[PDB]
C-alpha cells in the first residue's frame, strides 16, 4: 500500500528559499512518475510538474508559469523525494501534495490516483 | 485550454438523479479527462479515470458521459456521505488545467 | 497499367506557388520570391517522399494589370512591359526600385508586353554538389544546408506612370522535367508549421474506430 | 563463426545489406587501413520493462573512440561505410519485439515551434539518448521533441520500415547485422556538421516476463568502420 | 516570305503541355551525374515493403505504441473474435495510414491483392492455434466459429511457425479478415500469459493505378 | 565458464601489452587489444599471449 508523507512546511520570508522532503513507501520508486500539485485554500488546483521513472532517463516537464523559480530533483540512495524552492512571493501560500501516476492499460493516462497528506507552506 | 464547469453551487436532497458537467474550451480527447474527489479539508482522491472508467474501491452509481468538447457525470441515487467537492482535469498539451469547482451539499 | 505511376508522371505537373502583386508608383512596389519548394503544401508533400532530387526547372508568369483610381482628366496609356530579373545564387540583390543591381551584366531578365503569351523562362540545374538535399541533418544554425539555394526572382514595370497608378498581381508557375529520386522516405503524418524546418506537433497515428472487432 | 579483424574479435553464427550494393572505395585522398578498421563495442543500455527507445548518430558516436577521434578532427573531410551488430541475450522465458533500423539523414524537431535543438541533445558522445513515452513540454527552450509514436521526424512510426531495418524477435531471432553504404550527395563532406546516419532501436512489443528472471535484458550494439578515407596532405 | 497560318489555340497556356523552352542560362557547365545508391523509377517499389498495420485504435492506445499490439490472452471461453476489420476502400479505415494506403490516395481506380503477413511475438514455450477467416464479398460476417470454418480459412499453429502468409484481393459488404480463437495459450509455469500479435500490409506487386488526384490529408 | 546452460553474459578479455599501463576503465580496456566472449553461443575463449623472462 503506497503511502506518501512530506514535510517541511512552516513560516518563510518573501526572497528567500526553502526545500521539501516526501518520503516514498509501498512500491518500488523507480516505476512510477512522481507529480506535485498546490491548492490555494478555497481556490481551484494548479499542476506544477513531474519528474519520469528510471526507464525514462529521469527527465522533468515544468508548467509554463512557475519554470525556473524551482526545481524537481530525487535521490538516488532511498525512495525520497525533494522540491527546491527560490525566490518565493506572497502568492505562492498554499498547501503541497504528493501525488503518483501509473499506467491503466498499457499507455499513459495523465490522471493522478494517490495522493500525499499535504504539507502548508506560507509566507509573510 | 481553461475548463468551464457548470454550474458551481447545487444541493440535492437523498434519492434522486444529479448531473454536474465539464466544457472544454478546446475540443479535448475523450482519453484525457479525469475525475476527482475532495472531501472536507481530505487528500483528494480519484474517482473516474477516462471518462467511462471507474477507479479502484468506488460504488457502482457513477457513471461518466460526454465527448468533444462537453463532458458529464451522472450519479444515479444521492447517498449520505457524498457531498463534496468535484473537478475535472485535461490534457491537450502543457499545462494540465483543473476545473472550476462542483461543491454539493446534503438536503 | 503501371507506367502512370512512375516518377516522371508522378512529379511532371505545375502549380501555382506564388502570387503577389506590386504597384508602379508607391518607390516600394516590386515583387520578391526566393525559390524553394516548401511553400505550398501539396508540392511539398509529394517532393519530402524522396530525400535526393535532381531536376531542371521551367517557370511560367501570368501577368495581368487592373487600374488604380486615378483623380480625373481623361486617362490613357500604351501597353505595359514588365521587366522579370533572375538572381543566380551569389549574385547582388536590388533594395530600390531605381536601382543599380538591375541594370547589372550576369543577371538574365526578360521583358515581356502585354497582350502576347506569357513568357517562359527555365532554369538548368544549379547546385555545386551533386544532388537537391530535401532533408539535411547537420550545421550549416541548424538544418538550413546552404548547398541548395536556387536564386530569387525580381518584377517591376519599366513604364514610369504618367496620369494613372497601375498595380499589377504575377502568379508564378512552377514545373520539374527529368527528375531522378534517390533515398524514398515515409509520408509526413503530422502538419505543417514552419517553412524553413521540420518542427512539428505531436498527433495521433490513425483517426480510430470504436472497437477491436 | 569467430570473424577477427584489426586486434578485436567478436563471434557470431542472417545479413541485410543496405540497398543493395556492397561498400567499396573510389587532391588526392587516402585509405587507412591498420589503425581504425576495429569493433569499436559501444557500452550496453538495459533494457526495462516500460522502455521507449534509443538512438545513436553515426558520424559522432566514433569521436571519442581512440585513434578514430584523432581521424575525425585531423581529417575534417572524409567518407566512410558502416557495419552494425545488434544482438541482446535472454532466455526463454522473456518476450519482447525490437526494431532495428538505420535512417540517413533523420531530421528531428524541436520542441518550441521556433527554435531549433542544440547539439548536445541531438547526440549524446558515444552514448544513447532516449525516447520518452510522454510529450516532451513546451515551455523549456531547446529540447528535442521526443514522442515516441512519431519517432521525433513527424512521421508514423509502423511506416519506418522502408529503410534498411531488420526485425528482432525474442521468441526466434536473436541477432541483427547492417552493412550500410556511405549515402551522401557531396562525395567528400565535413565530418563535423554533419551526422549523415542515425541508428535507432524501438520496441514495439514490450519486455515481460514473470517473477523469478532477471528484471532487465542488456542490449550490446557493435559498430565497425570500413573504407575508411580521409583529406589531407 | 514563307507563308504560314496560325490555327487556334495559338496564344494559349496550357498548365500541362510540352514544349520545348529557352534556357535563361546558358555556359553554365552543370555539375556531373553520381552513382548515388538507392535509386526508385517507380513508385509501386515503395508498396512492396511491408509497414505495420495500426489494428487496435479504440480511441484511447491511438496516440501510443498500443496501437499495433493485438492482446492475446488464455481465457475461459473456447473461441472468441481475437480482432477483425473489415477491408472498405478509403473511408477511414485501418488500411488508411499505413505505407500502401499514403500511396493508393493519390489515384482512383485500382484493383488487385494484398498480402498479410502475420507475426506471433509471445514466448518461445508457449502453443496455441488460431483460425485465420477471410470472408468473400457479399457473403455476410461469420459470427461462429463454426461457419468461419466453412468459409475459406487458414489454420495458424504457433509452435511451429511464427508467421503465416495470407493472400486477398483489395479492389477500389466487401470482406472480413476475422481471426478466432481455436485452442487456449498452453503455458509452462513461470511464463507469462499475455501475448501480442503484430500485423503487416504489402503489394503482391500485381496491380495498376489510374486517374491521379491529389490527396485529402492536408488543409 | 562453468555456471547453468541458460545463463548468458558477455566478458571482454583485455590484455594489454609491457609498457602501457593497467586499464582502470572499460573503454579503454576495449581500446587496446581485446576479446568480447559470449556466454551463450560458445564456453571456451582461447587466448594467446608472449611472456618473456
Known amino acids: 500500500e503506497v503511502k506518501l508523507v512530506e514535510s517541511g512546511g512552516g513560516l518563510v520570508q518573501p526572497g528567500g528559499s526553502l526545500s521539501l522532503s516526501c518520503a516514498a513507501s509501498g512500491f518500488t520508486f523507480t516505476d512510477y512518475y512522481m507529480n506535485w500539485v498546490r491548492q490555494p485554500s478555497g481556490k481551484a488546483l494548479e499542476w506544477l510538474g513531474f519528474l519520469r521513472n528510471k526507464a525514462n532517463g529521469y527527465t522533468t516537464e515544468y508548467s509554463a508559469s512557475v519554470k525556473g523559480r524551482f526545481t524537481i530533483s530525487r535521490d538516488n540512495s532511498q525512495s525520497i523525494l525533494y522540491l527546491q524552492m527560490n525566490a518565493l512571493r506572497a502568492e505562492d501560500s498554499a498547501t503541497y501534495y504528493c501525488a503518483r501516476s501509473r499506467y491503466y492499460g498499457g499507455t499513459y493516462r495523465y490522471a493522478l490516483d494517490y495522493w500525499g497528506q499535504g504539507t502548508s507552506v506560507t509566507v509573510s | ?107 | 497499367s503501371r507506367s502512370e505511376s512512375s516518377i516522371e508522371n508522378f512529379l511532371c505537373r505545375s502549380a501555382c506557388v506564388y502570387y503577389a502583386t506590386y504597384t508602379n508608383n508607391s518607390k516600394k512596389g516590386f515583387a520578391e520570391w526566393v525559390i524553394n519548394t516548401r511553400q505550398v503544401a501539396q508540392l511539398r508533400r509529394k517532393l519530402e517522399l524522396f530525400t535526393y532530387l535532381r531536376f531542371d526547372l521551367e517557370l511560367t508568369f501570368v501577368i495581368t494589370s487592373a487600374q488604380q483610381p486615378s483623380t480625373a482628366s481623361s486617362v490613357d496609356a500604351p501597353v505595359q512591359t514588365h521587366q522579370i530579373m533572375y538572381v543566380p545564387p551569389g549574385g547582388p540583390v536590388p533594395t530600390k526600385v531605381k536601382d543599380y543591381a538591375w541594370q547589372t551584366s550576369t543577371n538574365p531578365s526578360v521583358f515581356w508586353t502585354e497582350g502576347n503569351a506569357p513568357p517562359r523562362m527555365s532554369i538548368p540545374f544549379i547546385s555545386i554538389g551533386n544532388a537537391y538535399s530535401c532533408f539535411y541533418d547537420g550545421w550549416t544554425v541548424y538544418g538550413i544546408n546552404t548547398l541548395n539555394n536556387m536564386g530569387t526572382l525580381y518584377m517591376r514595370h519599366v513604364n514610369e506612370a504618367g496620369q494613372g497608378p497601375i498595380k499589377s498581381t504575377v502568379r508564378i508557375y512552377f514545373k520539374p522535367k527529368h527528375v531522378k529520386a534517390w533515398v524514398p522516405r515515409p509520408p509526413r503524418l503530422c502538419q505543417y508549421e514552419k517553412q524553413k524546418n521540420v518542427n512539428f506537433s505531436p498527433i495521433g497515428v490513425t483517426t480510430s474506430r470504436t472497437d477491436i472487432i | 563463426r569467430s570473424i577477427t579483424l584489426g586486434n578485436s574479435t567478436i563471434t557470431t553464427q542472417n545479413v541485410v545489406v543496405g540497398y543493395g550494393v556492397w561498400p567499396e572505395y573510389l587532391d588526392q585522398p587516402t585509405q587507412p587501413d591498420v589503425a581504425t578498421c576495429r569493433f569499436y563495442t559501444l557500452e550496453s543500455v538495459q533494457w526495462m520493462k516500460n522502455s521507449a527507445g534509443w538512438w545513436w548518430k553515426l558520424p559522432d558516436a566514433l569521436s571519442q573512440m581512440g585513434l578514430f577521434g584523432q581521424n575525425m578532427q585531423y581529417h575534417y573531410l572524409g567518407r566512410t561505410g558502416y557495419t552494425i551488430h545488434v544482438q541482446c541475450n535472454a532466455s526463454k522465458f522473456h518476450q519482447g519485439c525490437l526494431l532495428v533500423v538505420c535512417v540517413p539523414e533523420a531530421e528531428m524537431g524541436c520542441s518550441n515551434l521556433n527554435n531549433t535543438p542544440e547539439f548536445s541533445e541531438l547526440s549524446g558522445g558515444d552514448s544513447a539518448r532516449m525516447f520518452t513515452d510522454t510529450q516532451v513540454g513546451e515551455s523549456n527552450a531547446k529540447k528535442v521533441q521526443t514522442a515516441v509514436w512519431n519517432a521525433g521526424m513527424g512521421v508514423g512510426v509502423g511506416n519506418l520500415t522502408i529503410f534498411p531495418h531488420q526485425w528482432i524477435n525474442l521468441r526466434t531471432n536473436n541477432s541483427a547485422t547492417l552493412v550500410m553504404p556511405y549515402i551522401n550527395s557531396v562525395p567528400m563532406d565535413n565530418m563535423f556538421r554533419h551526422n549523415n546516419l542515425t541508428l535507432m532501436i524501438i520496441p514495439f512489443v514490450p519486455l515481460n516476463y514473470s517473477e523469478g528472471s532477471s528484471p532487465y535484458v542488456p542490449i550490446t550494439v557493435t559498430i565497425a568502420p570500413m573504407c575508411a578515407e580521409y583529406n589531407g596532405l | 516570305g514563307l507563308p504560314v497560318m496560325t490555327t487556334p489555340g495559338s496564344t494559349q497556356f496550357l498548365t500541362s503541355d510540352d514544349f520545348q523552352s529557352p534556357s535563361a542560362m546558358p555556359q553554365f557547365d552543370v555539375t556531373p551525374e553520381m552513382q548515388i545508391p538507392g535509386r526508385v523509377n517507380n513508385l509501386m517499389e515503395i508498396a512492396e515493403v511491408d509497414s505495420v498495420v495500426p489494428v487496435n485504435n479504440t480511441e484511447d492506445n491511438v496516440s501510443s505504441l498500443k496501437a499495433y499490439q493485438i492482446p492475446v490472452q488464455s481465457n475461459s471461453d473456447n473461441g472468441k473474435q481475437v480482432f477483425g476489420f473489415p477491408l472498405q476502400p478509403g473511408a477511414n479505415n485501418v488500411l488508411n495510414r499505413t505505407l500502401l494506403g499514403e500511396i493508393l490516395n493519390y489515384y482512383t481506380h485500382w484493383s488487385g491483392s494484398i498480402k498479410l503477413t502475420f507475426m506471433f511475438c509471445g514466448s518461445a514455450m508457449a502453443t496455441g492455434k488460431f483460425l485465420l477467416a477471410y470472408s468473400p464479398p457479399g457473403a455476410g460476417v461469420p459470427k461462429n466459429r463454426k461457419d468461419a470454418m466453412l468459409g475459406t480459412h487458414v489454420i495458424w499453429d504457433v509452435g511451429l511457425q511464427s508467421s503465416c502468409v495470407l493472400c486477398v484481393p483489395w479492389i477500389s459488404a466487401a470482406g472480413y479478415v476475422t481471426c478466432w480463437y481455436q485452442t487456449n495459450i498452453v503455458v509452462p509455469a513461470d511464463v507469462q500469459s499475455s501475448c501480442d500479435i503484430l500485423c503487416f500490409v504489402s503489394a503482391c506487386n500485381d496491380f495498376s493505378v489510374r486517374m491521379l488526384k491529389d490527396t485529402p490529408f492536408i488543409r
Open chain 2, 1 to 107: 485550454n481553461v475548463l468551464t464547469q457548470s454550474p458551481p453551487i447545487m444541493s440535492a436532497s437523498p434519492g434522486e438523479k444529479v448531473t454536474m458537467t465539464c466544457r472544454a474550451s478546446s475540443s479535448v480527447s475523450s482519453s484525457y479527462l479525469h475525475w476527482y474527489q475532495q472531501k472536507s479539508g481530505a487528500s483528494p482522491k480519484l474517482w473516474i479515470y477516462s471518462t467511462s472508467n471507474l477507479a479502484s474501491g468506488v460504488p457502482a452509481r457513477f457513471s461518466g458521459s460526454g465527448s468533444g468538447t462537453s463532458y458529464s457525470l451522472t450519479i444515479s441515487s444521492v447517498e449520505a456521505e457524498d457531498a463534496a467537492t468535484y473537478y475535472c482535469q485535461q490534457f491537450s498539451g502543457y499545462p494540465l488545467t483543473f476545473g472550476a469547482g462542483t461543491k454539493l451539499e446534503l438536503k
